[PDB]
Each structure stands twice: as structure tokens, then as C-alpha cells.
């Protein structure tokens, strides 16, 4: 089975989209369309295991991201920024079982904490993928 | 072939289990059995090439770790941490051939710097995945 | 179909390639022989959507990179180094669609900011694979 995308934040001089999904506008791919780059979300179509991962830029402000599925943190990420004249930087990332329509997205899950950042040189990253797929070969037989 | 995990640390006030396996306690997703959350251990069962990722957070001390397969590093990861009031982060990952019953974990290699952490909204996770097995179709024909 | 890789950076007292690929010349897995750790580039062969991820240590001087698709920058990563007396850290990564003979590198991307490292205890590590293939089953069919 396929399912991948991968998009980057534009540059922005208003503050994120918080307390909802955070919108990475700008798609690098998605084939099948499973990202929304909207909205910001994905939404499954194969049930299976999925890895994601964000790699962001921190700037002028500390950084909280929730990795969300249907509204819950599957895992949670900071960095501090400590008022340096240049950025910093944070990744998360970890796997998770999805059915369809089972939705996953990232979220600043702290109000002061909406560092977020991309510029010429700098972008902040969400991606995921279908590691395997849970429509097993004997499905009735085994599993 | 299916061999995937995703797990993270609990929260603790007791320094980490060191010069041995770090145990991710709580399980995201391990359908396989392949992760032990109890030793922290992945147990290769399929030949092939895996990628394995850690995004820890990091906390009143600088953090030091190498991913390890059968006792030796594969790669070593370093963040300081400089005091501040709220943590940082760190993020490792490589690629690595298994096979079955090779072992691959994560371990703090240096002593003062055990600074790995989890909180209300902060974590520290341990993913790890077969990208391709190294059962080929015609095994003796070619390879 | 079968593609991956990955690489760590050797420790040196010269300053890394820049404007140009950056070697990373220690290989860790590389079975197809897709990446060339002469040039530092990993070349397609198998069209389809590939993880590029790079997981850096920062040492000395800040850092800044560029995953890089035919000389053309997909994503740009950043971490600044406040002087501090021990290493940070930078990781980024992204998803591609590529064709073969396509061809993908790190490279640092601005001048002053090559603080890129490794030492006995850290490493910088740069892996990529695919994730499925575009050389669909029914490719006349559909697609």
C-alpha cells in the first residue's frame, strides 16, 4: 500500500493557527492526497502503522507541539529559546496505528509557547507514511 | 514483512537506567512484540535494513545517548543543556542491517549526562522500523 | 522495491565540503550502492517517494544546511551554537517524489554557518529510503 506526504510552513508575520491544526501550507508531496494542506491534517485511508515527523524552526519564542490523533497528543515536544539573536531547532516524531478516517496533525499545545518559524533559510517540516499496512494476506485465517 | 514499535519514557524523579538498555516504558504501538518496553530492547525476527529515531527531550542536565546494536554504538547523540529555566531537545537517528535475534537499544554513554526527560507536555520517544527485509524473492538465483 | 541508506560524518579538524555536497564518509548501510560516500550524493534508481533525514551535531560556529534535489534546496535547517562549551544539536528531514538519476545531498547553505560535527561520543548522521515505489502494478490502467 502507498501513503506519504511531506509540506513545510510558509513564511508568516502573524502568529500560528493554534489551539486547532497547524497548517504546513506549502505540500513537498502528496500523492494521494491523504494530507490537507488546508486544514493541516491528515487523514488515514489504510489502516496500518505510520511513522510521523516534525522538524521545526524555533524563533523569538519557545516551542510546545503536540503530535495529534482525533484530537488527543500521541506525543508531546519543547524547545526553549532563550532569547539567542538567530533560531534554534526541535524534532519529534513516533509511530502510531490508524484506521480510515482517522486524522493526525500537529498542534502548539501551550499558549506562550508559539515559536514556530521558517524563513529563506530556515523551515519547520511535518511528514508521514504508511510503514505497513494492516490488510494482512490471511486475514481471516490468522490475525 | 511487518516489524515496527514506537514507545516513550515516563515521567520520573529516579535518574535513568544507565550503562545499560534506557527503557521506553509506555508503548505507543509494538503489534509484532518485537520492542520489550520492559528492558527497552527491539529483537530483530526479520532479516533486513531498519531506521530507528529518538526525539528526547532534554532537562537539568545535558544529555548524551548512543543507539546500540548488540552492545556497541552504532551512533552517538549530544545536546548541552546551559542551566536554562525549561528544557531542550535532541533528536538521533540512523539506518542499521539486522538479523534475527540482533538487538538494538538506547543507552547513555557518558556519566554526567543523563539529562533525558518527560513531563505533562513534554517527551521522550524511541521509534524503530523495517524499511526493506533482506529475504529476496530468487534467495540463491542471485544475492 | 529496495533503496536505503546511511552515513555518519568522519571526525576532522578541516572545515566540512561546502557549496557542494557534504561526505558523509563513514557508511553505516548501504546494500544497493545508491549512495556514493565519495561525493556524498545518493543517486535514484528506483522512481517512487523517499525520508531524507539528517541528525546533526552542532559545535563551535552555528549551523545551517540544505537537503538538496538536483542543486535545487527542498528544505533548509538551522540551529544556532550561543558559544557554549559543549556541542548542540539540529536535526531536519523531508519526503521526495524522485526519478532515476535524480540525485539528493546535504549541503550548508550559508557561509559563516558551517558548524557541523563529530567526536568520540557524537556523531552527524544523513539517511534516506524509499518508502514506495512509483512503478505502480496496473501502470497503463490507471495513474
Known sequence: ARSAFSAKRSESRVPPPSDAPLPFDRVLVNEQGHYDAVTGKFTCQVPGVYYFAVHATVYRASLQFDLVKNGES???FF???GGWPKP???SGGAMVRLE???QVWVQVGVGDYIGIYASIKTDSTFSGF???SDWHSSPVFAH
Open 74 to 76: 500521541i506525543a508531546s
Open 79 to 81: 524547545q526553549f529559546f
Open 88 to 90: 534554534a531547532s526541535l
Open 100 to 102: 480510515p478516517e482517522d
Open 130 to 132: 504508511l510503514v505497513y
